[PDB]
Amino acid sequence: NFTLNFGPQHPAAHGVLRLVLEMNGEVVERAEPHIGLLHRGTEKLIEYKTYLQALPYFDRLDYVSMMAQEHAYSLAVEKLLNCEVPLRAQYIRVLFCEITRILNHLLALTTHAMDVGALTPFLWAFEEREKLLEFYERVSGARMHASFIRPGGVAQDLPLGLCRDIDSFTQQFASRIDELEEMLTGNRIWKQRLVDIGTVTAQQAKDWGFSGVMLRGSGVCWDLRRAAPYDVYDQLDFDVPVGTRGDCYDRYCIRIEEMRQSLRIIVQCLNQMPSGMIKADDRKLCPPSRCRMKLSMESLIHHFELYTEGFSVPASSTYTAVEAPKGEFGVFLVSNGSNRPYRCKIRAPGFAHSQGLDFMSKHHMLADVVTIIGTQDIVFGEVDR
Amino acid sequence: RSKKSPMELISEVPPIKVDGRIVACEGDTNPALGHPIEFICLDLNEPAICKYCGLRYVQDHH
Amino acid sequence: PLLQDGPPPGGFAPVRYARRISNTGPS
Amino acid sequence: KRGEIGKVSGIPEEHLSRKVIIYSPARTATQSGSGKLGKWKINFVSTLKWENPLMGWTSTGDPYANVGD
Amino acid sequence: KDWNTVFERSINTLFLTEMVRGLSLTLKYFFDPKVTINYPFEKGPLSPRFRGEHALRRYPTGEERCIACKLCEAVCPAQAITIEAEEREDGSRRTTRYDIDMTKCIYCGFCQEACPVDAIVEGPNFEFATETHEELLYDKEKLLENGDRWETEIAENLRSESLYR
Amino acid sequence: IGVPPNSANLTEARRRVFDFFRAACRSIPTIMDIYNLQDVVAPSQLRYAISAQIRNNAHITDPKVIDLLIFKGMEELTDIVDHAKQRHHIIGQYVVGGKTDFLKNFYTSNYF
Amino acid sequence: IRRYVLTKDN
Amino acid sequence: RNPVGGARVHFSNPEDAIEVFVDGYAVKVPKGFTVLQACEVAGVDIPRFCYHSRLSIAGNCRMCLVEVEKSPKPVASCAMPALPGMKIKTDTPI
Amino acid sequence: NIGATLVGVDKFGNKYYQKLGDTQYGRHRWVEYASKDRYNASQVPAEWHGWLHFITDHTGDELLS
Amino acid sequence: AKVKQTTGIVGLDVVPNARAVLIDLYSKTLKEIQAVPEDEGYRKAVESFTRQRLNVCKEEEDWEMIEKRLGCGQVEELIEEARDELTLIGKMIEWDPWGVPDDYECEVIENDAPIPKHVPQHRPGPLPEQFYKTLEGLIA
Amino acid sequence: MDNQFIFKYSWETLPKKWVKKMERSEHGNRFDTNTDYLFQLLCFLKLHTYTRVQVLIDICGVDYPSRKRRFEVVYNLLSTRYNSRIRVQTSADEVTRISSVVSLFPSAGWWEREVWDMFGVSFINHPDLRRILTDYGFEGHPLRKDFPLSGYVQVRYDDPEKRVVSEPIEMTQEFRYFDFASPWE
Ligand SMILES: CCCCCCCCCCCC(=O)SCCNC(=O)CCNC(=O)[C@H](O)C(C)(C)COP(=O)(O)O
Ligand code: SF4
Numbered sequence A: 001n002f003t004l005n006f007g008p009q010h011p012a013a014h015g016v017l018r019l020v021l022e023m024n025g026e027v028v029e030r031a032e033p034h035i036g037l038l039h040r041g042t043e044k045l046i047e048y049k050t051y052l053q054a055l056p057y058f059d060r061l062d063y064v065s066m067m068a069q070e071h072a073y074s075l076a077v078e079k080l081l082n083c084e085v086p087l088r089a090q091y092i093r094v095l096f097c098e099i100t101r102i103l104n105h106l107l108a109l110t111t112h113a114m115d116v117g118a119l120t121p122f123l124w125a126f127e128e129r130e131k132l133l134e135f136y137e138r139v140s141g142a143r144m145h146a147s148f149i150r151p152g153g154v155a156q157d158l159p160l161g162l163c164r165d166i167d168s169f170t171q172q173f174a175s176r177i178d179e180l181e182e183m184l185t186g187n188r189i190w191k192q193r194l195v196d197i198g199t200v201t202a203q204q205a206k207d208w209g210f211s212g213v214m215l216r217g218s219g220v221c222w223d224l225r226r227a228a229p230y231d232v233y234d235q236l237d238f239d240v241p242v243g244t245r246g247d248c249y250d251r252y253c254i255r256i257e258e259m260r261q262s263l264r265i266i267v268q269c270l271n272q273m274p275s276g277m278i279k280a281d282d283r284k285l286c287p288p289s290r291c292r293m294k295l296s297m298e299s300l301i302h303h304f305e306l307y308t309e310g311f312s313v314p315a316s317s318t319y320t321a322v323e324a325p326k327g328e329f330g331v332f333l334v335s336n337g338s339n340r341p342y343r344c345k346i347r348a349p350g351f352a353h354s355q356g357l358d359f360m361s362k363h364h365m366l367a368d369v370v371t372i373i374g375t376q377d378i379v380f381g382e383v384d385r
Numbered sequence B: 001r002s003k004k005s006p007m008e009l010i011s012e013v014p015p016i017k018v019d020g021r022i023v024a025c026e027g028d029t030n031p032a033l034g035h036p037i038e039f040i041c042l043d044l045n046e047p048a049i050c051k052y053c054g055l056r057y058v059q060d061h062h
Numbered sequence C: 001p002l003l004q005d006g007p008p009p010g011g012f013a014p015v016r017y018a019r020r021i022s023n024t025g026p027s
Numbered sequence D: 001k002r003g004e005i006g007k008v009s010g011i012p013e014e015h016l017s018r019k020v021i022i023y024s025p026a027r028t029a030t031q032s033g034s035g036k037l038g039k040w041k042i043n044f045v046s047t048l049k050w051e052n053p054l055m056g057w058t059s060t061g062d063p064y065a066n067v068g069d
Numbered sequence E: 001k002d003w004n005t006v007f008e009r010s011i012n013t014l015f016l017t018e019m020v021r022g023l024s025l026t027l028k029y030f031f032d033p034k035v036t037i038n039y040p041f042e043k044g045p046l047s048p049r050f051r052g053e054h055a056l057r058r059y060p061t062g063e064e065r066c067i068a069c070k071l072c073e074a075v076c077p078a079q080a081i082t083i084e085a086e087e088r089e090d091g092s093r094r095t096t097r098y099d100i101d102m103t104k105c106i107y108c109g110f111c112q113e114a115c116p117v118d119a120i121v122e123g124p125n126f127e128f129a130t131e132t133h134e135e136l137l138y139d140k141e142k143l144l145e146n147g148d149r150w151e152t153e154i155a156e157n158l159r160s161e162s163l164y165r
Numbered sequence F: 001i002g003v004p005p006n007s008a009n010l011t012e013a014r015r016r017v018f019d020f021f022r023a024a025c026r027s028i029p030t031i032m033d034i035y036n037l038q039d040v041v042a043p044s045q046l047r048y049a050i051s052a053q054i055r056n057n058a059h060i061t062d063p064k065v066i067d068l069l070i071f072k073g074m075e076e077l078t079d080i081v082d083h084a085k086q087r088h089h090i091i092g093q094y095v096v097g098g099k100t101d102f103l104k105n106f107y108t109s110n111y112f
Numbered sequence G: 001i002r003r004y005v006l007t008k009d010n
Numbered sequence H: 001r002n003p004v005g006g007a008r009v010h011f012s013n014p015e016d017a018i019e020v021f022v023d024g025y026a027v028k029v030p031k032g033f034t035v036l037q038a039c040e041v042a043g044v045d046i047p048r049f050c051y052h053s054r055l056s057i058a059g060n061c062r063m064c065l066v067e068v069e070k071s072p073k074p075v076a077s078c079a080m081p082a083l084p085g086m087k088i089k090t091d092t093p094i
Numbered sequence I: 001n002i003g004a005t006l007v008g009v010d011k012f013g014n015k016y017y018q019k020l021g022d023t024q025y026g027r028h029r030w031v032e033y034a035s036k037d038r039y040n041a042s043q044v045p046a047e048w049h050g051w052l053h054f055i056t057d058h059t060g061d062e063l064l065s
Numbered sequence J: 001a002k003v004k005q006t007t008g009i010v011g012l013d014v015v016p017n018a019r020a021v022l023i024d025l026y027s028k029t030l031k032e033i034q035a036v037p038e039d040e041g042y043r044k045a046v047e048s049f050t051r052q053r054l055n056v057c058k059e060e061e062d063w064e065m066i067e068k069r070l071g072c073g074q075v076e077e078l079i080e081e082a083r084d085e086l087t088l089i090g091k092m093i094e095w096d097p098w099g100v101p102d103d104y105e106c107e108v109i110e111n112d113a114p115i116p117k118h119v120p121q122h123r124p125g126p127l128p129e130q131f132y133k134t135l136e137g138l139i140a
Numbered sequence K: 001m002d003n004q005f006i007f008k009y010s011w012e013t014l015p016k017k018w019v020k021k022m023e024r025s026e027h028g029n030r031f032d033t034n035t036d037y038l039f040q041l042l043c044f045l046k047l048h049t050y051t052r053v054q055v056l057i058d059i060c061g062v063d064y065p066s067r068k069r070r071f072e073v074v075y076n077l078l079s080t081r082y083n084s085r086i087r088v089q090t091s092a093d094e095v096t097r098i099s100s101v102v103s104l105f106p107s108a109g110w111w112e113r114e115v116w117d118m119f120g121v122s123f124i125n126h127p128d129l130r131r132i133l134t135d136y137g138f139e140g141h142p143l144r145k146d147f148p149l150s151g152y153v154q155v156r157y158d159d160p161e162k163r164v165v166s167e168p169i170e171m172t173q174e175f176r177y178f179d180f181a182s183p184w185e
């Protein structure tokens, strides 16, 4: 058999994808993904930064789901600090994590359908993506890389009209999802290009470290928001969709259902969000108000010490994982008692999913390899740090 | 008037007359939009300079 | 201050989240 | 010196013949605290620095410019 | 199965009854108002918290607010700021060199929220693409010009988030 | 296939060195074709280059260090066999190559 | 921390 | 445990050496050391503002106040001489 | 620029228009540049920049005072 | 009463007979754990839970009832546990790790630093009673 | 199911000669074992009925230059059936070959390749142990504490040579290290 190379440099498929395929005829026999083109030394750069200075690195890991990584990093720091977060901050974090989940799912579904050949749903979904990123631009000052979720509480408070605008969005996102489904779900070509492609058994998913939609499509009811709940996720009502055949079509139906349930969670968070402060009151770990630093001596001392040295995490090590839109995103943070992390491994779900591309694509058509790559929803920011 | 450096511009503002022996300088009418509060002792003959603003305060009567 | 972002009194109006059926066509 | 680990590490041969100083940094004279004491450091004596003739920034060509610190 | 069900699903197979339902959906969006904006004339909505081009502010008296505390250079996660300071002729603590690398800047706003005197701010300007790399090495004069040119909008925005910061 | 278990004595280390050297020597014909080295280098100068590397790394007496050196050399050989590295790279590494040294260094710079 | 050390204990 | 900053205590004789309990730990110090110095031998570093090891003692700032069992009020560790059998407490609520 | 209200004029001569939106918006805040030579793509002063980008509701004539 | 239509798990297939493929695996497990020394913690637990599950599989004829009383997965997730325990027994026998060293020592650190409540924590429900019965068997 | 139950069960059932350090806390129940018993422990913890750990989350290394056994290899494990996490750690220096667990967990391959690339730890019986993240021909293991942050070599285009070439590194602005440590810690 010959040795064929797909390097798509154009971001019509990821952009830094490099597959070296061994094709017998039209079937592919082994898929070896060549990674390392987006390895920017993020893990080593964390060890040279303060715990506050290393927060923006997590925005650029999974650049389609930004708040998901910040939530995990903040939870790891809180676990190593035993820092309690106010209820309003927890509700805001859950709200902006479920907005993030919808953003990631909307991008993934349509960048996967564009690979197949469906161009129309891509623009329709990016319209709602822009509508959602407007909310990102409102709380923070950045459309994508918002350093909003922070270890103590949250960076700053919500503008006045944000809740009303988010409710107005949720009044029509259901019809938007209905249109997006009606363009793809009933189509026979979409069924023929997804059904029975990429079948994975539950044992294979467990052995290869699959998580999220890749794992729940095989029948495994494993959600980290229900197995190891964090924040206020245990006070919210939402269902966990589970697949039956493990193919690419189940990964798509579940990726629809997880976004409808995300809309449901967003509505509940809007309705039940309480009043109060948005940051922990231990100003030894959180910044003082700008009116208090210019009027009180100890507040100014705290500001000065926090914005140069930052806080010091007691010597310990732990692993915290959250339910990122791709799957289980974990951070292994090691502290030696100083103001800089000693070691911080980033466990990316894409790393464990692109590794299993070899067995998912074996004995499949060449044109069926792009659907297998797109159904895993891989971004290379996290695959190679 | 770009030819005037900020030093020359802050050297042209007349000192503020204060009746008491001490004045508090915040840097702006709205406290939250200025610099940290600075208490200046007006017990000399030369005008007393704010170390943030550069504004000068002088005692009015005594 | 004491005027903080949140839901209006009585909560927000209910919003559909399930699939709406479409029976279009004579068949 | 049995620098076998240096040979199986990946450090270039030019940087494996450096002369270093092993010392314990002392307490600063401007503070009375004694927290940053008891740790030992390796000083690579990295002094070859110059000035960028575009912005005045400090340029260097020594990889071991800040590792030991 | 049932004859009626078999016939009904066989008609849909041969009459493409699930592609007409998508063609109708596309045609409905064809006759529909567009959502595109004329970028040169009309701009997209923004927020007062927008983190754009940096600007160094000055007091209304004409004195620059920067006090060379170097509190923004130590919080900068990208090491994009370099500050050199000394005692000015009046004896005040001011900067001689204040330059920001906008090719290293990640536009995170940490410098803006760390300044104790509101000297460095990220203004609303986001249209400053240059034709040369050295034009992106902003210095003190360039930053002060930015602060003077965007002073009113920056002041209004700082008034807006005074209730939140 | 799999990474071999760590050696227990110097004789096994020597055997692995010889096996790796033989494999590298058999890899010489492939490199001359994958890269246009036909009218560049004799088929023995490269062989001498690998021999020289083995010989100037021949003062090691720790079997673990020898095994690690062999593993790194095998990784380098496998990379060179593939089209991974650029052409001039091997030609920049694998080619065999007056007053006072002190006075020339003094004329060059203060940092010896 | 309760770092007691186990032993064979016959 | 080691003294703070690797401080070397010079015992002129083994006989003139009292015993104190800085935090329940047996500490041997010569007669003449203060509570602050005894704590420095036992690895505990007391806050200080006005005390300098090369200057005369002057208990101004009152920042090195510790708890002593046979004391109704906190004592300035910089100036209080160490007594045999004295139990110092530094991390108590007082 | 049809069925629209002119909010104000600029020192460079740029005219700013506004139209009322109902539920979906579109062409409700734009500029008619007084130049045509490529218009430089950036000629809006700081008093009018905020109004155009919906940062502030002040027109810019009111932002001057 | 009827045969299980689907297991709900991809790759795992319904076994038409589950009371006869489990009563044999448990018997094999009990007849092969004998090679392990009597006073070892592995043998006691592996011979306790295997006896209870074997008795349960002998009492009730229908798979639904077996699923109810054991209450730990489907009968198709118990066969894959029995077949793995059988493999583990053989691997233990060939490795023979049963020899307690004379110089053995273990540092049992016991940390108690609390963690916050919003922090993700794995909180399962109460295990079936056998998971504790085997535990008291091991301690005793 | 829980840290209180898993600790007590593994105390009794596990062979004593394998594990030499057992921390039980809320940050995570850890097991520290010798490198010659790692595969045995992980195979036991993958097949036992009450400790069905079927998911290997990741394999990471930690660099401690002050220790004799410099590198610490951490195996974060997950049990889906009992909803519990277990962490297993070993220690290895720069010239020891620890056993590979790709036989038990197929996902261990890329993590072991990344550990070898980043720290230089070699794994016995690994189907293919080559660098996975660093550039082709990369020399040195970057995630070591003695490796400089910016590395040793730099990449630029050489017009006369008509190819991208590698040159010794030379920064226009060096990395400024700020020492914020406090003496009153
Ligand atoms: C294009 C090809 C790509 C790959 C080329 C190779 C690149 C790596 C080159 C190898 C790197 C190494 O150091 S790997 C080999 C290093 N290992 C040793 O040198 C073992 C110590 N030497 C001895 O024991 C003896 O001197 C001995 C020399 C054996 C003979 O002498 P005797 O038997 O009398 O005793
Ligand atoms: S915005 Fe962030 S990266 Fe840019 S100069 Fe300020 S602190 Fe540095």
Ligand code: SF4
Pocket: E065, E066, E067, E068, E069, E070, E071, E072, E073, E083, E114, E115, E116, E117, E118, E119, E120
């Ligand atoms: S801009 Fe602000 S933070 Fe930066 S040096 Fe000047 S006063 Fe300090």
Ligand code: FES
Pocket: H047, H048, H049, H050, H051, H058, H059, H060, H061, H062, H063, H064, H065, H076, H077, H078, H079
């Ligand atoms: S140090 Fe000031 S009272 Fe003792």
Ligand SMILES: [Zn+2]
Pocket: B025, B026, B027, B035, B038, B050, B051, B052, B053, B054, B055
């Ligand atoms: Zn002032």
